[PDB]
Amino acid sequence: HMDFKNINLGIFGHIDHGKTTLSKVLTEIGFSAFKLENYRITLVDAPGHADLIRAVVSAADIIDLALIVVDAKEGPKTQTGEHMLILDHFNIPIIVVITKSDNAGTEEIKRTEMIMKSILQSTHNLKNSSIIPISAKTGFGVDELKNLIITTLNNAEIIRNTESYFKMPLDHAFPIKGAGTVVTGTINKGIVKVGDELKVLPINMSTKVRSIQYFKESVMEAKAGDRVGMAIQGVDAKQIYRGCILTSKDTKLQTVDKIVAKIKISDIFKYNLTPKMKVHLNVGMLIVPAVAVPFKKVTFGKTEENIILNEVISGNECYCAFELEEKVLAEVGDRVLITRLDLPPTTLRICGHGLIEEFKPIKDLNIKKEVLREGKVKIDKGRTVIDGLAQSKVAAEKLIGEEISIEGKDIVGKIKGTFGTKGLLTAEFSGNVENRDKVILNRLRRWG
Ligand SMILES: Nc1nc2c(ncn2[C@@H]2O[C@H](COP(=O)(O)OP(=O)(O)O)[C@@H](O)[C@H]2O)c(=O)[nH]1
Numbered sequence: 001h002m003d004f005k006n007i008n009l010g011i012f013g014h015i016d017h018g019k020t021t022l023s024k025v026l027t028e029i030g031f032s033a034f035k036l037e038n039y040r041i042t043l044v045d046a047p048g049h050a051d052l053i054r055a056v057v058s059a060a061d062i063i064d065l066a067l068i069v070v071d072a073k074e075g076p077k078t079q080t081g082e083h084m085l086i087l088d089h090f091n092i093p094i095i096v097v098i099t100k101s102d103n104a105g106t107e108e109i110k111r112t113e114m115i116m117k118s119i120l121q122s123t124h125n126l127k128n129s130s131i132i133p134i135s136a137k138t139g140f141g142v143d144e145l146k147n148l149i150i151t152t153l154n155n156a157e158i159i160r161n162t163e164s165y166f167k168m169p170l171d172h173a174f175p176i177k178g179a180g181t182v183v184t185g186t187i188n189k190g191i192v193k194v195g196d197e198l199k200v201l202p203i204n205m206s207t208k209v210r211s212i213q214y215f216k217e218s219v220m221e222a223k224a225g226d227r228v229g230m231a232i233q234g235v236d237a238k239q240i241y242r243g244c245i246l247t248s249k250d251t252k253l254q255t256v257d258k259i260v261a262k263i264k265i266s267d268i269f270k271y272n273l274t275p276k277m278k279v280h281l282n283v284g285m286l287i288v289p290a291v292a293v294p295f296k297k298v299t300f301g302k303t304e305e306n307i308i309l310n311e312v313i314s315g316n317e318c319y320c321a322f323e324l325e326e327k328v329l330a331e332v333g334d335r336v337l338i339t340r341l342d343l344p345p346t347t348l349r350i351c352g353h354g355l356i357e358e359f360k361p362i363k364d365l366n367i368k369k370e371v372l373r374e375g376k377v378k379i380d381k382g383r384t385v386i387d388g389l390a391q392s393k394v395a396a397e398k399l400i401g402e403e404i405s406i407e408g409k410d411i412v413g414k415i416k417g418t419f420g421t422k423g424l425l426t427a428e429f430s431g432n433v434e435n436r437d438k439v440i441l442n443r444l445r446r447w448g
Pocket residue numbers: 013014015016017018019020021022099100101102103134135136137138
């Protein structure tokens with residue numbers, strides 16, 4: 001017959017907004033799927049709030065399209081917001097579906113519609129995404145929703161990665177007996193054939209593939225993007241839990257403690273740069289408490305330094321050094337999601353996102369502090385003094401023999417002397433120094 005294309009469709013939104021009902025309506029035309037044209041569409045499914053999060057963080061590669069449901073009457077709520085954010089960070093095309101249109105008047109629907117438009121405009125990659133009102137109970141606009149899903153899937157670039165090592169997470173695990181186990185999950189990268197030797201991580205065992213179940217059918221081979229059941233031998237299902245990963249033996253996957261990421265910030269005004277910060281880091285399918293130290297990479301003309309962030313977010317660099325409390329499975333280039341989930345569900349919980357550049361500890365990053373002390377130039381008759389670099393004779397004495405520049409005048413000087421008990425100094429300059437001049441003291445420090 002005709003060649004099918006395998007699609008994974010996520011469904012997101014606040015609870016009671018009609019996620020489940022929409023899913024059921026879609027599935028009638030574990031594993032729950034439906035067909036549109038030649039698209040085989042498997043629903044990415046988790047019960048709710050944090051589960052969808054854990055689902056996207058891990059499965060982002062293979063999630064082609066997402067439906068974000070919003071009640072017509074009460075409009076966007078918090079969870080709608082965080083789902084929107086997450087989907088924006090991971091660059092997943094979305095359709096905004098306004099549910100329960102039968103329970104709302106035209107005016108209300110148009111209102112919510114416009115609110116959603118305004119919201120969509122505040123996002124990077126979701127900037128304009130089509131919005132349809134529907135009623136899953138009534139069937140209102142559902143046909144149009146299907147046609148739209150088709151159009152969107154037609155436009156979006158769907159890249160399945162076969163070429164790399166086989167990489168799949170494990171959602172569920174069923175023992176049969178001591179000699180066998182069945183796991184279920186969607187393949188991220190690579191290819192599997194029946195009778196292959198793979199491994200479970202972090203526990204690092206070695207198992208063989210007995211059976212591949214795809215689309216309620218047995219197949220010899222599965223590919224990335226396919227959501228499959230798999231029977232494997234050499235493991236009991238008690239050892240396999242929420243964070244386990246089945247992968248080939250050529251794998252680049254590592255069990256990691258320290259993670260260095262390149263971080264993009266979601267909302268600038270809600271974001272804060274105070275270093276050594278306690279957050280919840282989403283990596284793969286887990287969420288591990290973590291400590292973060294924001295820093296930027298500066299080229300001084302000879303050596304590249306990693307300097308603690310100057311609190312300026314101008315320029316997009318926010319390399320974060322993360323130290324994790326627990327372990328995690330990661331690869332270089334994996335999308336990582338910084339959340340604060342300690343906060344109540346009532347407020348937006350996303351503290352960032354970013355690509356893992358290196359697995360490295362802070363101590364080896366040679367972290368440094370940019371050090372600037374500013375003081376003025378007071379000149380009485382015949383004598384030049386610098387004020388404000390030191391608050392006492394002790395500190396003033398500590399400063400002797402440093403490098404100092406004068407602002408905007410392009411003039412260099414060294415500070416030799418220490419004047420008075422109040423911390424005044426004396427310095428050697430190139431000539432043409434004037435009263436009330438600006439002195440910048442510049443040096444590199446050991447941070448923390
Ligand atoms: N009138 C109407 N009610 C709906 C529609 N979709 C869902 N509901 C109702 O909303 C309630 C909860 O929706 P649900 O499917 O559980 O959404 P979820 O909890 O976010 O997955 C149920 O009692 C449904 O009857 C709709 O299109 N029209």
